[PDB]
């Protein structure tokens, strides 16, 4: 793997102590989200990461059961189209064997993006098939 210079420089910094939109308690799934947010903030584009997670979720639906334990993101073609920050993070997880936290790091990243963009999300819990009627 040949990570870009920018990500290499950021990975060696104490970015964990930098300022963020929200003060979330430290956690394994939070460190990766902070790294993605910091990397995306430099470029100023955050929707690219969200698209990457969408592609990952779509790809995972076709991968064999327990793909996160035999995972090789480099060999997987679906992840070849991901952005450098997301691909670097996936390799970062695969090295530590924490690829099972993909669906939770994304949640944190979305929370940071929404806070930065000043968006408040309201969760509407409805019965199976009630998504049609979200009016009241």
């Amino acid at each position: 793997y040949t990570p870009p210079e920018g990500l290499k420089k950021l990975y060696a910094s104490d970015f964990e102590n930098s300022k963020y939109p929200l003060n979330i308690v430290p956690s394994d799934s939070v460190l990766f989200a902070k790294f993605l947010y910091k990397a995306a903030e430099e470029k100023g584009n955050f929707d690219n990461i969200l698209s990457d997670f969408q592609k990952i979720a779509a790809a995972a639906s076709k991968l064999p059961i327990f793909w996160e334990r035999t995972a090789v993101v480099e060999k997987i073609p679906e992840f070849k189209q991901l952005s450098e920050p997301t691909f670097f993070t996936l390799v970062w997880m695969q090295n530590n064997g924490m690829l099972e936290l993909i669906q939770e790091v994304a949640e944190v990243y979305e929370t940071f993006v929404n806070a930065k963009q000043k968006k408040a999300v309201a969760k509407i819990f409805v019965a199976p098939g009630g998504e049609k009627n979200v009016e009241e």
Partner: protein
């Protein structure tokens, strides 16, 4: 004019009569040694007591009632208050639980 509760996270693990909670990102958080309600149904709740507050954000919960109804992934609401029970001369001659339920 709504009976708005204070959701603080979800139920992660259950081991017998105790449980663990994972807080949802960007939520108020729960206080130590307080009572919480696990929404086993849209109208039914199970009582729990906060016992641990870990660095990871996970919360240790001591279940008190309706344990069989508790499942992983359920929602948790925080009352934000310690345990209070009925007291007075109107309880004499009765059999009650530690929670005050007759």
């Amino acid at each position: 004019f709504f009976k708005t509760t204070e959701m603080i996270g979800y139920v992660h693990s259950i081991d017998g009569t105790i449980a663990t909670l994972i807080p949802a990102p960007g939520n108020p958080g729960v206080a130590y040694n307080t009572i919480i309600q696990i929404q086993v149904s849209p109208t039914t709740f199970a009582a729990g007591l906060v016992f641990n507050l870990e660095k990871d954000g996970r919360i240790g919960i001591i279940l008190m009632d309706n344990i069989t109804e508790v499942q992983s992934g359920q929602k948790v609401m925080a009352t934000g208050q310690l345990l209070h029970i009925p007291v007075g001369a109107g309880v004499l001659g009765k059999v009650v639980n530690p929670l005050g339920h007759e």
